[PDB]
Write a protein that binds this DNA or RNA. Sequence first.
RNA 1: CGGGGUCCGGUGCGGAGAGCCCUUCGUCCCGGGAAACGGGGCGCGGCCGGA
RNA 2: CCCAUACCCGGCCGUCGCUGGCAGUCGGCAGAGCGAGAAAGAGAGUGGCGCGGACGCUACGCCGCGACGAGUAGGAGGGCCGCUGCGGUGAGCCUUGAAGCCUAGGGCGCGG
RNA 3: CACGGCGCGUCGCGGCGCGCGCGAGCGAGCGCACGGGGUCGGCGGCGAUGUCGGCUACCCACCCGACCCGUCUUGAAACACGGACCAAGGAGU
RNA 4: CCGGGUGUUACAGCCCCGCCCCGGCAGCAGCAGCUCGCCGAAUCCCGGGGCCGAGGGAGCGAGACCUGUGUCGCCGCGCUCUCCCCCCU
Lengths: 216, 109
Amino acid sequence: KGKPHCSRNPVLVRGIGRYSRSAMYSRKALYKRKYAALATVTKPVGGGTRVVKLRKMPRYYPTEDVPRKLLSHGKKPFSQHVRKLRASITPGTILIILTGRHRGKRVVFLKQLSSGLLLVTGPLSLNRVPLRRTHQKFVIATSTKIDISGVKIPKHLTDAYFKKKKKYEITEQRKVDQKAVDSQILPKIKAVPQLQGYLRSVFALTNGVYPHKLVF
Amino acid sequence: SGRLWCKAIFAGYKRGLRNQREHTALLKIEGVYARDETEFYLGKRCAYVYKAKNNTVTPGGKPNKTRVIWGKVTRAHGNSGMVRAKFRSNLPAKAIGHRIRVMLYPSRI
RNA sequence: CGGGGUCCGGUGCGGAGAGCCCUUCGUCCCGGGAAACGGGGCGCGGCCGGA
RNA sequence: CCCAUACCCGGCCGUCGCUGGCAGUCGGCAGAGCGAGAAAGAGAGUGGCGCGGACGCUACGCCGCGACGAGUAGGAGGGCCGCUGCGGUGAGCCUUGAAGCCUAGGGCGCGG
RNA sequence: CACGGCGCGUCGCGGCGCGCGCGAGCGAGCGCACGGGGUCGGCGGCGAUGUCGGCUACCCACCCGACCCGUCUUGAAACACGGACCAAGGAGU
RNA sequence: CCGGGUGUUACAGCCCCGCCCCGGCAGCAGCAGCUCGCCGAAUCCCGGGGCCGAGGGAGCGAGACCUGUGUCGCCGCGCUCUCCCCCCU
Ligand SMILES: [Mg+2]
Ligand SMILES: [Mg+2]
Ligand SMILES: [Mg+2]
Ligand SMILES: [Mg+2]
Ligand SMILES: [Mg+2]
Ligand SMILES: [Mg+2]
Ligand SMILES: [Mg+2]
Ligand SMILES: [Mg+2]
Ligand SMILES: [Mg+2]
Ligand SMILES: [Mg+2]
């Protein structure tokens, strides 16, 4: 019993607390918190009753087996890895896809997903790309942004939604979600002059220009 | 539609004067000629692309005559923008002074 | 028409190679801007231009 | 700024040292330890349901830590390297094909 | 502030130090991790007569390296000596 | 405007020297991001690139009234077995 209180010290730096041992002994009020000192089931049968033993022994042991592994601590499954995002990437930023089938297409970025992939879309009405996922490494984040803080995207879309199944047919749910997102995205980009044509165009490298020199 | 990589020339292997180490290549990336300009290309993937005689399978397409040796940029070399690269297999010596594409998708911007 | 004179402009070369040109997602409607002399044509027949 | 077989970190082979550790596989007849800064007893005593638990250990074996590795003349050790014959042994092989010879085939061993 | 009980407190210098008892040296759970050597409870493609894999080995190309062995010798690639090539025999018993 | 000469503050300035609280005020090995140093028990934070991941039965608690489990040792922490208050869903 007892409601779980939050930690009494803000994290000063990772692994170091703001308050020392005595300050903690005071804040926790421990000066007044002193304390001092299955495998069988009976069943009826039509005889009598039988004590059936669940978890019965195997009917085959292999010729030989591998031993156990030593224990390690710092290794966690991909589900609960901490997700990182580049500072230059914020909702409403223009990205340049570098490796997909949509090579060098300028695309608007909306949301960071749960597994770290970026939920991205440039309204397929003009640059022909749907709601999609893209790894944050394989995109160039240019320094041009629109304001999409006042748009709502459905909460039902997620990595489970975008996960591949199994010919691929687009679903009516996909169509309606794309329409719902673009109906709010498009007027925002149409406010900025010469932005729809910019998104329609495709990025490329000509001779005499070098990425380390040019800024974006 | 356009070109999404940068030109480099496979100048030669990392070497002394009488010894050469074929597990590391030297690339001259076009347009960069100093150390304070090569930090952009560190860690970028590079590809040596060449044609052959037999057809080979390709990702997302029908088989063709093209083959690729992949690699990555490891560190700067010298003071004049030369770059050290490491490939999954040591490049053939016939590629000296030929084109290697350094791409951008291992991006940090 | 070319070569000289005066004069006027530039001169860390803005008539700059630290530069210039072309710039490619495509198609469909209607409007504005440029053009009506323009665009495209082994579509054309000639005339010059080159050692 | 460039690079040696030098130096630092890591992997692997071997040698040497610790004359290191393991007979404790002590199981419903049992109780799963002897890594822990401090020479020595998880000391013995007498008075005020479900029947269950991987591998091991050719001890000439297995396992763990460190350091080291140039070599002529020469010395020593190990060769499940090789050739021929003899005593044993393989209820061995073989005319449904031995020996020998050839091979752009598949492999093992640092090597023989 | 790696301070935290009550006492008998001289176990004491004037309280702090610092001793003797307090069922007598047994409070428990959960959780996070810069903690005695990597995991994913993360994914994507291409596969039947043209494609996948094959270190080495067959042939060829390229860059770097690279003088013919044995022997006597201070010193051998030597303008020092033995050696065209192959098979069998051949020397610490 | 220039050249030569004289000279001692004039229609520019320079150097030294008693004090005025070492006169006063910043500031200070200065992001006036190069005027000249040595450092860090008087030092911490964040980030990027490259190579590698060798080893594989470490135990926990359960108590002769039980026999489960495979997130374990050392180390650093947080919450509860006390009670209140504040804020956001
Ligand atoms: Mg070492
Ligand atoms: Mg030796
Ligand atoms: Mg042969
Ligand atoms: Mg040579
Ligand atoms: Mg001789
Ligand atoms: Mg001699
Ligand atoms: Mg002679
Ligand atoms: Mg002679
Ligand atoms: Mg002769
Ligand atoms: Mg012979």
